[PDB]
Design a protein around this ligand. Structure first.
Ligand SMILES: Cc1ncc(COP(=O)(O)O)c(/C=N/[C@@H]2[C@H](O)[C@@H](O)[C@@H](OP(=O)(O)OP(=O)(O)OC[C@H]3O[C@@H](n4cc(C)c(=O)[nH]c4=O)C[C@@H]3O)O[C@@H]2C)c1O
Ligand SMILES: Cc1ncc(COP(=O)(O)O)c(/C=N/[C@@H]2[C@H](O)[C@@H](O)[C@@H](OP(=O)(O)OP(=O)(O)OC[C@H]3O[C@@H](n4cc(C)c(=O)[nH]c4=O)C[C@@H]3O)O[C@@H]2C)c1O
Lengths: 370, 370
């Protein structure tokens, strides 16, 4: 019926690898395919240790756990992000300090961060929105200056780079998602924790396995959780990593079709297209546009629904939310976060999106704008 | 080469159900197979709300979250259990209070619980060891008298009952595991939270969905996590639930082979076999035997290894573990927990264990004992 906003990536090989996993008699976490995926991720992206988890949320929770977040500790992050980015730390008793976005990338504004730092700050968590890297050199410098840890929420950033560097690998800890909505999926749910700070590796491994030294009599040695994805899901993921470049190249092609078709409307000021800072290489996770305001956006959404095409808005700013006024505080003026969140619209974009269907989406779009 | 202690259940239909899930274009949590599994569990076992999670550990954590565990709260549980039963509550700041097991079932001794209660106590979490029920009528009466929640750790108990009631459906909250070592697996990892106290359902659903509302704009409404298993895993589990009785019956037959073969050695006092209290219906999750002591057990373990047969001990008592001395306290005397844990040996038992290999195992056992 409808052209969907998203469909999980399907390469065609997942079933064979999964079959193989089932044949091996090991399906729980940390099996052969889990290990191969971690190896793949470690070597290709350049991280000392990668650990596959049930979700990026779990990886984020794990980072907070690793960094020993205490009640009262302050964690700086955008208000324009997914709930999990905040919950992971609130779960540890953190106070969330929100910082406004830069409107060009919808990323945390690296220039507004230092002003929000206090003697209580212990972590900053940049979010690489749409797989477009935050201004990390600046952010890493600030963090060295104020003795802060950096946890990358690189959920959307698998295959993206910043100045040649793989996203998720530039901070003490990085986090990936393999949710069905991402560029790569582990059978529908999944994440990875990237432990880039070598000093944290020992404990990371222990808390991943329920606080035991299972990777080694094993016994209760620390807090932890079951931060393992099934090896069945890892087999699925392994199939997709085998096609990492094929998927990425196709998504980028689709992304550029959108850009080429909508560029004239942008040069006329009717809309805005995404910005990709110099030195940042994206992975085409998302193609968003900015309408004039929420009414403009709502009208387009309805026009597209009439055309059996599903387009979608994204984050509701966390700080304005019930839990957000309670668990956090917005530092400075909300100049862009709420406004920009209300004009941002995401277009159908996924690996298996047919050329004919993308043309349909595009023709319908060019129709709305006149 | 070796006859293993365990192999994940393979029914033969899992591939087809998973193909269907992949064919549907929905693989993330809370898709069709997740809903069907929850329906099956709710109706067959009689629980108001069942929610599939990435692990029993996740379910235990969710339970701790639901019950609003605060730092200083005391939670009573056996020391003879898996680390997660404790970690889930320690994560919330609970102090763990350990109570000795009754040796016949290795379950928490229901008569030793009240002596451990203080004004700080808020939860007791009985563990149904080997899928054999704790003395639940007594424990629930006890908990009602003192206004305590009961969280069942029923990880090993899918298909077991207590006086006609499905294990996991009795306490305010129950927890299942669908890990590869269990009787039913969701592709290697998985769990379920059973919300039997209807009053907890509303919040349960919100916590489960990253602290948001799925009346489906949605927004940040509470703390929570990503307590979703992928629908791919749910498809696998659904296949296994379709063969729930066949699997259970096959395990029970294998179990009885062990009991029948080893009974004479037990009547001679050389070993002890498991006890199943009246009113308890087990699910043949495990067949353990008790040797005279740890040296006897090690000798038998090595003898079997020689025979290319893998037999295995189980929990190391949490109260004696590094983390356990720090996060918890053993109330009273350790009369049975440590002693009994050291003579207990678990025998190869899994759905796809061939009769010929079981005969080999039994024969090797009868050989060791003379
Ligand atoms: C930085 C960051 N950190 C962490 C994680 C977590 O990773 P893990 O899951 O692996 O643990 C993520 C991933 N989030 C993705 C999607 O980006 C997210 O949008 C949402 O996707 P959905 O399943 O809901 O479907 P959809 O088509 O993306 O939208 C469907 C409708 O929901 C409306 N909506 C949406 C949002 C977001 C919101 O706030 N408020 C809101 O009303 C818009 C639509 O009409 O959930 C996913 C996991 C992340 O980006
Ligand atoms: C009440 C309860 N609550 C919660 C949960 C968690 O649920 P989820 O996983 O679903 O999230 C569980 C599940 N536990 C099972 C198994 O019961 C458990 O044995 C263990 O199994 P393994 O994967 O490790 O393999 P194995 O063959 O069972 O043993 C392997 C060797 O390790 C040695 N060993 C073992 C233990 C236990 C220990 O402490 N110390 C130790 O040195 C014994 C062997 O030689 O872990 C599983 C998840 C549970 O029972």
């Amino acid at each position: 019926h409808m052209i969907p906003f998203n469909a999980p990536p399907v390469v065609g090989t997942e079933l064979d690898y999964m079959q193989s996993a089932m044949g091996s008699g090991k399906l729980c976490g940390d099996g052969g395919f889990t290990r191969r995926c971690q190896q793949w991720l470690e070597q290709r992206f350049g991280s000392a240790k990668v650990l596959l988890t049930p979700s990026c949320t779990a990886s984020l929770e794990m980072a907070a756990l690793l960094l020993d977040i205490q009640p009262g500790d302050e964690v700086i992050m955008p208000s324009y992000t997914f709930v999990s980015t905040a919950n992971a730390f609130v779960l540890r008793g953190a106070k969330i300090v929100f910082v406004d976005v830069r409107p060009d990338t919808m990323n945390i504004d690296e220039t507004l961060i230092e002003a929000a730092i206090t003697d209580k700050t212990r972590v900053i968590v940049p979010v690489h929105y749409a797989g477009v890297a935050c201004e990390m050199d600046t952010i890493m410098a600030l963090a060295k200056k104020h003795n802060l840890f950096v946890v990358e929420d690189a959920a959307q950033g698998v295959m993206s780079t910043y100045k040649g560097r793989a996203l998720g690998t530039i901070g003490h800890i990085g986090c990936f998602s393999f949710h069905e909505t991402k560029n790569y999926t582990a059978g529908g749910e999944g994440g990875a924790t990237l432990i880039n700070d070598k000093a944290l590796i020992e404990r990371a491994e222990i808390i991943r396995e329920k606080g035991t030294n299972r990777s080694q009599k094993y016994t209760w040695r620390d807090i932890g959780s079951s931060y393992l994805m099934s090896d069945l899901q890892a087999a699925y993921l392994w199939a997709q990593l085998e096609a990492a470049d094929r998927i990425n190249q196709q998504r980028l092609a689709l992304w550029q079709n959108y850009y080429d078709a909508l560029a004239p409307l942008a040069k006329a000021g009717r809309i805005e297209l995404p910005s990709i800072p110099d030195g940042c290489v994206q992975n085409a996770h998302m193609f968003y546009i900015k309408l004039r305001d929420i009414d403009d956006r709502s009208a387009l959404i309805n026009f597209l629904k009439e055309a059996e095409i599903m387009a979608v808005f994204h984050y509701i700013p966390l700080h304005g939310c019930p839990a957000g006024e309670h668990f956090g505080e917005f530092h400075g003026e909300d100049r862009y976060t709420t406004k920009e969140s209300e004009r941002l619209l995401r277009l159908p974009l996924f690996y298996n999106l047919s050329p004919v269907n993308q043309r349909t989406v595009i023709a319908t779009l060019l129709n709305y704008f006149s």
